[PDB]
């Protein structure tokens, strides 16, 4: 501080900048038919 004053850079001209942000709030609702995935339609597999 020279004489009680500090050197500061103060803006003399400005613009607006746009900044886009994506926030994920959802995901695909995956549904699995567990019996059809594991065994398809085979009776011996469904029994096991």
């Amino acid at each position: 501080s020279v004489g009680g004053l500090y050197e500061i850079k103060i803006p003399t001209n400005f613009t607006i900048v746009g900044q886009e942000e994506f926030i994920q709030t959802n995901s695909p609702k995956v549904t699995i038919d567990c019996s059809l995935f594991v065994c398809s339609n085979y009776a011996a597999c469904h029994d096991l």
Binding site: T31, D33, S35, L36, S40, N41
Partner: protein, 48 residues
């Protein structure tokens, strides 16, 4: 709301395809041969 396991559509017919691997005997081709021998000089062919 309940996701009910609807049946898979049952196949109505069967399709089989496979290379026969071994060649055809073609017994008819040799039997249809017009130059048939006499019993005196009977011809012999082995189909293996």
């Amino acid at each position: 709301v309940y996701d009910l396991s609807g049946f898979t559509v049952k196949p109505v017919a069967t399709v089989h395809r496979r290379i026969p691997d071994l060649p055809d005997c073609d017994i008819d081709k040799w039997l249809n041969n017009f130059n048939v021998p006499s019993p005196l000089n009977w011809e012999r062919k082995i189909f293996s």
